[PDB]
Amino acid sequence: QVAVAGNAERLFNGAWYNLFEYGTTYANIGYRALQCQDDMMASDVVSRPKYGFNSSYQFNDVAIPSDGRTSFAWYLIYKTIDNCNTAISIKGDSEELRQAQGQALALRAFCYLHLVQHYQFTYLKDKDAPCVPIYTEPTTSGTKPKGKSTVAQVYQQIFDDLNLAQDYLTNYVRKGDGQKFKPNTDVVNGLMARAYLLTGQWGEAAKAAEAARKGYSLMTTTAEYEGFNNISNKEWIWGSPQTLSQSDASYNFYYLDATYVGAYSSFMADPHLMDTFVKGDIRLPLFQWMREGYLGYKKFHMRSDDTADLVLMRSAEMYLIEAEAKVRDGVALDQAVAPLNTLRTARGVGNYDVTGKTKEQVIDEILMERRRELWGEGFGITDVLRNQKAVERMALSEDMQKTEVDCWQEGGSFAKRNPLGHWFLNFPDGKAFSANSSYYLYAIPEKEINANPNL
């Protein structure tokens, strides 16, 4: 019977449940804490010191091999991979099984995309460098630990899985916005887009991205943009739905939601990033001086039931991939920015003028747009690594620090404060921020190292 497809479907939903809901502590609940980690440890978030990710901001967690987050991150992703491996191993012959396994393959490719980017420097720095062990068979009592595969071997596995997922999800149609956590053809093209971009296949990168955003539009108003907590949103190609009964991951919104009363609200924005927004941009009104003097950015909000759906892929990202890829591929600059300009118009900003500009300059501008647009969605340190840049933090000027700003408080009341920006301006070792630093990579955890004689 078709109960076999039900089994593969069970394991995928199990893999999905694990990735988002599994938590060792309150600062380490699911994949969203890793997205929190990856932005806080980068350039655009200013830590309002609080339980959770103050450590991330000070480069005091994921590079430490015996640290708690370090262990959490590793086992959560490999736990997810093993459930996927089990689904993919099921023998059978139906449309529903192949779709379920297609989803499993897409999630496995996503997990290995996480792994290759977090545990070794970027493909285009050194593609044959050791990375992480690759497991594709389900883990049993006879399974031995494996040595590291190369960065190029993990991307190969990623591509193999994404190519078989495309094939298996050809006829799959999502039955509603609540099913937008299930990978579909759009998601496979999105992940391919990311993968091509990471391996420097610029032409393919642009092609995949454009195809990935099929059917999706772009939000055009401030009111639509504020909240980032609903899977029905038209830009969302992929996310996880959160509900009263299954909402552990939403605890992460106690960190992200700037205006939540009595929570952490520890993800403040770098004022220097706000200074790069053009007046009239629909995102600008979301900035708000608040609390102790920090610049809030009211992008994320808990809903009334104290939950929020979890975004994983938007059409705005797909537009930005296309712009970068096209410029890097040598497409004439005026054609290359067409996708960039589609995003800017949607956000209320006029076209980007490429007259006089080098490719470098236009790429620089696309990367600044990524930081503006994807703020808080978990792309920070992977973009830093991908482009072989350093983290970039600068304190407000002393003239700016001497200023006073009207600051919102938890009552709706306002009081004057002195503005606060970046405060952790170099590495803990006293050295200035630099490219391809080991502070940027997650460490393989002690527990793995001790148990696996191949590392």
Coordinates of C-alpha atoms in Angstrom, one line a residue:
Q1 CA 0.0 0.0 0.0
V2 CA 0.9 3.7 0.2
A3 CA 1.7 3.5 3.9
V4 CA 5.3 3.5 2.8
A5 CA 5.1 7.1 1.6
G6 CA 3.5 7.9 5.0
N7 CA 6.7 6.5 6.6
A8 CA 9.1 8.7 4.5
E9 CA 6.6 11.6 5.2
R10 CA 6.9 10.8 8.9
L11 CA 10.7 11.0 8.9
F12 CA 10.8 14.3 7.0
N13 CA 8.3 15.9 9.4
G14 CA 10.5 14.4 12.2
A15 CA 13.6 15.8 10.7
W16 CA 11.8 19.2 10.3
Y17 CA 10.5 19.1 13.9
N18 CA 14.1 18.4 15.2
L19 CA 15.8 21.2 13.2
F20 CA 13.5 23.9 14.5
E21 CA 12.1 22.7 17.9
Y22 CA 15.1 20.9 19.4
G23 CA 16.8 22.9 22.1
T24 CA 19.5 22.2 24.8
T25 CA 19.1 25.5 26.6
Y26 CA 17.0 28.7 26.1
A27 CA 19.7 30.4 24.0
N28 CA 20.0 27.2 21.8
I29 CA 16.5 26.3 20.6
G30 CA 16.6 25.0 17.0
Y31 CA 17.9 26.4 13.7
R32 CA 16.7 30.0 14.6
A33 CA 19.3 30.3 17.4
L34 CA 21.9 29.5 14.7
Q35 CA 20.4 32.2 12.5
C36 CA 20.6 34.5 15.6
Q37 CA 24.2 33.4 16.1
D38 CA 25.2 34.1 12.5
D39 CA 24.0 37.7 12.4
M40 CA 25.0 38.7 15.9
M41 CA 28.6 37.5 15.3
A42 CA 28.8 39.6 12.1
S43 CA 28.7 43.3 11.3
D44 CA 25.2 44.7 11.5
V45 CA 23.8 43.8 14.9
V46 CA 24.7 45.7 18.1
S47 CA 24.4 43.6 21.3
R48 CA 22.2 44.9 24.0
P49 CA 23.9 42.8 26.7
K50 CA 21.5 40.0 27.6
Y51 CA 21.3 36.2 28.0
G52 CA 21.7 34.5 24.6
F53 CA 24.0 36.1 22.1
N54 CA 26.1 38.7 23.9
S55 CA 28.7 35.8 23.7
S56 CA 28.2 35.7 19.9
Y57 CA 28.9 39.5 19.6
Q58 CA 32.2 39.1 21.6
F59 CA 33.4 36.0 19.6
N60 CA 33.1 33.9 22.8
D61 CA 31.1 30.7 21.8
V62 CA 31.1 28.8 18.5
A63 CA 34.9 28.8 17.8
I64 CA 35.5 27.3 21.3
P65 CA 35.5 23.4 20.8
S66 CA 34.1 22.6 24.3
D67 CA 31.4 25.4 24.3
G68 CA 27.7 24.5 24.7
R69 CA 26.5 26.1 21.5
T70 CA 29.3 24.5 19.5
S71 CA 28.0 21.0 20.5
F72 CA 24.3 22.0 20.0
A73 CA 25.0 23.2 16.4
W74 CA 26.8 20.0 15.3
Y75 CA 24.4 17.4 16.7
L76 CA 21.2 19.3 15.7
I77 CA 22.3 19.4 12.0
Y78 CA 23.6 15.7 11.9
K79 CA 20.5 14.6 13.8
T80 CA 18.5 16.3 11.0
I81 CA 20.7 14.6 8.4
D82 CA 20.1 11.1 9.8
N83 CA 16.3 11.3 9.8
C84 CA 16.6 12.5 6.1
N85 CA 19.0 9.6 5.4
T86 CA 16.4 7.2 6.7
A87 CA 13.6 8.7 4.6
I88 CA 15.8 8.5 1.5
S89 CA 16.6 4.9 2.2
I90 CA 13.0 3.7 2.1
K91 CA 12.4 1.3 -0.9
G92 CA 9.1 1.7 -2.7
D93 CA 7.4 3.0 -5.9
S94 CA 4.9 5.8 -5.7
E95 CA 4.5 9.5 -6.5
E96 CA 4.0 10.4 -2.9
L97 CA 7.1 8.5 -1.7
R98 CA 9.3 10.2 -4.3
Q99 CA 7.9 13.6 -3.3
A100 CA 8.5 12.9 0.4
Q101 CA 12.1 11.7 -0.4
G102 CA 12.5 14.7 -2.7
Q103 CA 11.8 16.9 0.3
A104 CA 14.2 14.8 2.4
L105 CA 16.9 15.2 -0.2
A106 CA 16.3 19.0 -0.3
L107 CA 16.6 19.2 3.5
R108 CA 19.8 17.1 3.5
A109 CA 21.3 19.4 0.8
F110 CA 20.3 22.4 3.0
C111 CA 22.0 20.8 6.1
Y112 CA 25.2 20.1 4.2
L113 CA 25.1 23.7 2.8
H114 CA 25.0 24.9 6.4
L115 CA 27.9 22.5 7.3
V116 CA 30.3 23.4 4.5
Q117 CA 29.8 27.1 5.0
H118 CA 30.3 27.0 8.8
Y119 CA 33.2 24.6 9.4
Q120 CA 35.8 25.6 6.8
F121 CA 36.6 28.7 4.7
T122 CA 34.9 29.3 1.5
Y123 CA 34.9 27.1 -1.6
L124 CA 36.6 29.7 -3.8
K125 CA 39.4 30.2 -1.2
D126 CA 40.4 26.5 -1.2
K127 CA 37.9 23.9 -2.6
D128 CA 39.9 20.8 -1.7
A129 CA 40.3 21.7 2.0
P130 CA 39.0 19.2 4.6
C131 CA 35.5 20.0 5.8
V132 CA 33.2 17.6 7.7
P133 CA 32.2 13.9 7.5
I134 CA 29.4 13.1 5.0
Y135 CA 26.8 10.5 6.0
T136 CA 24.1 9.5 3.5
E137 CA 23.2 6.1 4.9
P138 CA 21.0 5.9 8.0
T139 CA 23.0 5.6 11.3
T140 CA 22.7 2.1 12.8
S141 CA 24.6 0.1 15.5
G142 CA 27.2 -1.0 12.9
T143 CA 28.0 2.5 11.7
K144 CA 31.5 3.7 12.3
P145 CA 32.4 7.4 12.5
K146 CA 33.9 8.9 9.3
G147 CA 36.8 11.2 8.5
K148 CA 36.4 14.6 6.9
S149 CA 35.4 15.0 3.2
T150 CA 36.6 18.0 1.3
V151 CA 34.7 21.3 0.7
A152 CA 34.4 20.2 -3.0
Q153 CA 33.1 16.8 -2.0
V154 CA 30.4 18.3 0.3
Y155 CA 29.2 20.6 -2.5
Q156 CA 29.2 17.6 -4.9
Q157 CA 26.8 15.8 -2.4
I158 CA 24.8 19.0 -2.2
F159 CA 24.4 19.1 -6.0
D160 CA 23.6 15.4 -6.3
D161 CA 20.9 15.7 -3.7
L162 CA 19.5 19.0 -5.2
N163 CA 19.4 17.4 -8.7
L164 CA 17.5 14.4 -7.5
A165 CA 15.2 16.5 -5.4
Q166 CA 14.3 18.6 -8.6
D167 CA 13.5 15.4 -10.4
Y168 CA 11.4 14.0 -7.5
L169 CA 9.4 17.2 -6.8
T170 CA 8.5 17.8 -10.5
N171 CA 4.8 17.2 -10.0
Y172 CA 4.6 18.3 -6.3
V173 CA 2.1 21.1 -5.6
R174 CA 1.9 22.6 -2.1
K175 CA -1.6 22.2 -0.5
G176 CA -1.7 25.7 1.1
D177 CA 0.5 28.3 2.9
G178 CA 0.8 26.0 6.0
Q179 CA 2.7 23.5 3.7
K180 CA 5.3 26.2 2.8
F181 CA 7.8 24.3 5.1
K182 CA 7.8 21.5 2.6
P183 CA 10.5 21.9 -0.1
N184 CA 9.1 22.3 -3.6
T185 CA 10.6 23.1 -7.0
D186 CA 10.9 26.8 -6.0
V187 CA 13.0 25.8 -2.9
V188 CA 15.2 23.4 -4.9
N189 CA 16.0 26.3 -7.3
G190 CA 16.6 28.6 -4.4
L191 CA 19.1 26.2 -2.8
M192 CA 20.7 25.6 -6.2
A193 CA 21.0 29.4 -6.6
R194 CA 22.8 29.5 -3.2
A195 CA 25.0 26.6 -4.1
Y196 CA 26.0 27.9 -7.6
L197 CA 26.8 31.3 -6.1
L198 CA 29.0 29.6 -3.4
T199 CA 30.9 27.6 -6.1
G200 CA 31.3 30.6 -8.4
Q201 CA 29.0 29.4 -11.2
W202 CA 27.6 32.9 -11.7
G203 CA 25.6 32.2 -14.9
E204 CA 23.8 29.2 -13.3
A205 CA 23.4 31.2 -10.0
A206 CA 21.4 33.9 -11.8
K207 CA 19.3 31.4 -13.8
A208 CA 18.3 29.4 -10.6
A209 CA 17.4 32.5 -8.6
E210 CA 15.0 34.0 -11.2
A211 CA 13.3 30.7 -11.6
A212 CA 13.1 30.3 -7.8
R213 CA 11.0 33.4 -7.4
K214 CA 8.3 32.2 -9.8
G215 CA 4.9 33.5 -8.7
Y216 CA 6.3 35.5 -5.7
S217 CA 5.9 39.3 -5.6
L218 CA 7.6 42.0 -3.5
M219 CA 6.1 43.8 -0.5
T220 CA 5.8 47.5 -1.3
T221 CA 4.7 49.3 2.0
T222 CA 6.0 49.9 5.5
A223 CA 3.0 48.2 7.0
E224 CA 3.6 45.0 5.1
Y225 CA 7.3 45.0 6.0
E226 CA 7.0 45.2 9.8
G227 CA 6.5 41.9 11.5
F228 CA 8.3 39.1 9.6
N229 CA 6.2 36.5 11.4
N230 CA 3.6 35.1 8.9
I231 CA 4.2 32.3 6.4
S232 CA 1.4 33.6 4.2
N233 CA 3.6 36.6 3.3
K234 CA 4.0 36.9 -0.5
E235 CA 7.8 37.1 -0.5
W236 CA 8.2 33.9 1.5
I237 CA 9.3 31.0 -0.7
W238 CA 10.1 28.8 2.4
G239 CA 9.5 29.0 6.2
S240 CA 8.4 27.1 9.3
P241 CA 4.9 27.6 10.7
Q242 CA 4.6 28.1 14.5
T243 CA 1.4 27.4 16.4
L244 CA 0.2 27.4 20.1
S245 CA 0.8 23.6 20.3
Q246 CA 4.2 23.6 18.5
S247 CA 6.1 26.9 19.1
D248 CA 9.4 26.3 21.0
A249 CA 11.4 28.0 18.2
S250 CA 9.3 31.2 18.7
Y251 CA 11.2 31.7 22.1
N252 CA 13.9 33.0 19.8
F253 CA 11.7 36.1 19.1
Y254 CA 12.3 37.2 22.7
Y255 CA 15.8 38.2 21.5
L256 CA 14.7 39.6 18.0
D257 CA 11.6 41.6 18.8
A258 CA 12.8 45.1 19.6
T259 CA 9.5 46.3 21.2
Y260 CA 8.6 43.3 23.2
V261 CA 7.8 44.2 26.8
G262 CA 9.7 42.2 29.5
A263 CA 11.8 40.0 27.1
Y264 CA 15.4 40.2 26.0
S265 CA 15.2 42.6 23.0
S266 CA 18.9 42.2 22.5
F267 CA 19.3 42.5 18.7
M268 CA 19.7 46.2 18.2
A269 CA 20.8 47.7 14.8
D270 CA 24.1 49.4 13.9
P271 CA 23.2 53.0 13.3
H272 CA 25.8 53.2 10.5
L273 CA 23.7 50.7 8.6
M274 CA 20.6 52.9 9.0
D275 CA 22.7 55.8 7.5
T276 CA 22.9 53.9 4.2
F277 CA 19.1 53.9 3.7
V278 CA 17.7 56.4 1.1
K279 CA 15.0 58.7 2.4
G280 CA 11.6 57.3 1.3
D281 CA 12.7 53.7 1.6
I282 CA 9.8 51.7 3.2
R283 CA 12.2 50.1 5.7
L284 CA 13.4 53.4 7.3
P285 CA 10.4 54.1 9.5
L286 CA 11.1 50.7 11.3
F287 CA 14.2 52.3 12.9
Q288 CA 13.6 53.8 16.3
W289 CA 15.9 55.1 19.1
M290 CA 14.8 53.3 22.2
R291 CA 15.5 52.0 25.7
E292 CA 19.0 52.8 26.9
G293 CA 20.0 54.7 23.7
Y294 CA 20.1 51.8 21.2
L295 CA 18.7 52.1 17.7
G296 CA 16.0 49.5 17.4
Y297 CA 14.9 48.1 14.0
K298 CA 11.3 46.9 14.4
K299 CA 11.5 44.3 11.6
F300 CA 10.5 41.3 13.8
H301 CA 7.5 40.9 16.0
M302 CA 5.8 38.2 18.1
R303 CA 2.1 37.8 17.2
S304 CA -0.6 38.0 19.9
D305 CA -0.4 34.3 20.6
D306 CA 3.3 34.8 21.5
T307 CA 4.5 32.9 18.4
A308 CA 6.0 33.8 15.0
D309 CA 6.5 31.8 11.8
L310 CA 10.1 31.4 10.8
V311 CA 11.3 32.7 7.4
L312 CA 13.9 30.7 5.5
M313 CA 13.8 32.0 1.9
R314 CA 12.3 35.2 0.3
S315 CA 12.0 36.6 -3.2
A316 CA 14.1 39.6 -2.2
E317 CA 17.1 37.2 -1.6
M318 CA 16.5 35.7 -5.0
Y319 CA 16.6 39.1 -6.6
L320 CA 19.9 39.9 -4.9
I321 CA 21.5 36.6 -5.9
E322 CA 20.7 37.4 -9.5
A323 CA 22.1 40.9 -9.3
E324 CA 25.4 39.7 -7.8
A325 CA 25.8 36.7 -10.0
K326 CA 25.1 38.8 -13.2
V327 CA 27.7 41.4 -12.4
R328 CA 30.3 38.8 -11.5
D329 CA 29.4 36.9 -14.7
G330 CA 30.3 40.0 -16.8
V331 CA 26.8 41.0 -17.8
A332 CA 26.7 44.7 -18.8
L333 CA 26.3 46.7 -15.6
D334 CA 23.0 48.3 -16.8
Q335 CA 21.5 44.8 -17.3
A336 CA 23.0 43.3 -14.2
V337 CA 21.2 45.7 -11.8
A338 CA 17.8 45.2 -13.3
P339 CA 16.9 42.7 -10.4
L340 CA 18.6 45.0 -7.9
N341 CA 16.4 47.9 -9.2
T342 CA 13.2 45.7 -9.0
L343 CA 14.0 45.3 -5.3
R344 CA 14.8 49.0 -4.8
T345 CA 11.6 50.2 -6.5
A346 CA 9.5 47.8 -4.4
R347 CA 11.2 49.4 -1.3
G348 CA 10.5 53.0 -2.5
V349 CA 14.0 53.8 -3.8
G350 CA 14.9 55.1 -7.3
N351 CA 17.1 53.1 -9.7
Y352 CA 20.8 52.5 -8.9
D353 CA 22.9 54.6 -11.4
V354 CA 25.8 52.5 -12.7
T355 CA 27.4 55.3 -14.7
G356 CA 31.1 55.6 -13.8
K357 CA 30.9 52.6 -11.5
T358 CA 33.3 49.6 -11.7
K359 CA 32.0 46.0 -11.2
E360 CA 33.6 46.0 -7.8
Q361 CA 31.6 49.1 -6.8
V362 CA 28.3 47.7 -8.1
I363 CA 29.0 44.3 -6.3
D364 CA 29.9 46.4 -3.1
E365 CA 26.4 48.0 -3.4
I366 CA 24.6 44.7 -3.9
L367 CA 26.3 43.4 -0.7
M368 CA 25.3 46.4 1.3
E369 CA 21.7 45.8 0.0
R370 CA 21.9 42.2 1.3
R371 CA 22.9 43.5 4.7
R372 CA 20.0 46.1 4.7
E373 CA 17.4 43.7 3.4
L374 CA 18.2 40.4 5.1
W375 CA 19.2 41.9 8.5
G376 CA 18.4 39.4 11.3
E377 CA 17.5 36.6 8.9
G378 CA 20.8 34.7 9.5
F379 CA 23.0 35.5 6.5
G380 CA 25.6 37.7 8.2
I381 CA 28.7 35.5 8.9
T382 CA 28.1 33.3 5.8
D383 CA 28.2 36.5 3.6
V384 CA 31.4 37.6 5.5
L385 CA 33.0 34.2 4.8
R386 CA 31.7 33.8 1.2
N387 CA 33.2 37.1 0.1
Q388 CA 36.4 36.6 2.2
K389 CA 35.8 39.8 4.0
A390 CA 36.3 40.8 7.6
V391 CA 33.7 41.7 10.2
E392 CA 33.2 45.4 10.1
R393 CA 32.2 47.4 13.3
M394 CA 32.7 51.1 14.0
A395 CA 31.6 53.0 17.1
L396 CA 29.4 56.0 16.6
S397 CA 31.5 59.2 16.5
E398 CA 32.2 61.0 19.8
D399 CA 30.3 64.0 18.5
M400 CA 27.4 61.6 17.8
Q401 CA 27.9 60.0 21.3
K402 CA 27.6 63.5 22.9
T403 CA 24.3 64.0 21.1
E404 CA 20.9 63.2 22.8
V405 CA 18.1 61.2 21.1
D406 CA 14.4 60.8 21.9
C407 CA 14.1 57.1 22.9
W408 CA 11.0 54.9 23.1
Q409 CA 10.4 53.0 26.3
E410 CA 8.3 49.9 27.2
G411 CA 5.3 52.1 28.1
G412 CA 5.1 54.0 24.9
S413 CA 6.7 56.9 26.9
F414 CA 9.7 58.7 25.6
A415 CA 12.9 59.9 27.4
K416 CA 16.2 61.4 26.2
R417 CA 19.3 59.2 26.0
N418 CA 22.8 59.4 24.4
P419 CA 22.9 57.2 21.3
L420 CA 24.6 53.8 21.5
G421 CA 26.2 51.9 18.6
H422 CA 28.9 49.2 18.2
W423 CA 31.1 48.6 21.3
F424 CA 33.1 45.4 20.6
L425 CA 35.4 46.7 18.0
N426 CA 38.2 44.1 17.7
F427 CA 38.8 40.4 18.4
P428 CA 39.3 39.1 22.0
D429 CA 43.0 38.4 21.2
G430 CA 43.4 42.2 20.7
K431 CA 44.0 41.8 17.0
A432 CA 42.0 43.9 14.5
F433 CA 39.1 42.2 12.6
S434 CA 40.4 40.4 9.5
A435 CA 39.3 38.1 6.6
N436 CA 39.1 34.3 6.9
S437 CA 39.7 34.4 10.7
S438 CA 39.1 31.2 12.7
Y439 CA 36.8 33.2 14.9
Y440 CA 34.3 33.1 12.1
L441 CA 34.1 29.3 11.9
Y442 CA 32.0 27.1 14.1
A443 CA 34.4 24.5 15.7
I444 CA 33.8 20.7 15.4
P445 CA 32.8 20.0 19.0
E446 CA 35.0 18.2 21.6
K447 CA 32.5 15.3 22.0
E448 CA 32.8 14.5 18.3
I449 CA 36.6 14.8 18.3
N450 CA 37.0 12.5 21.3
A451 CA 34.6 9.9 19.9
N452 CA 35.8 10.0 16.3
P453 CA 39.4 8.7 15.8
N454 CA 39.5 10.1 12.2
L455 CA 39.5 13.8 13.1

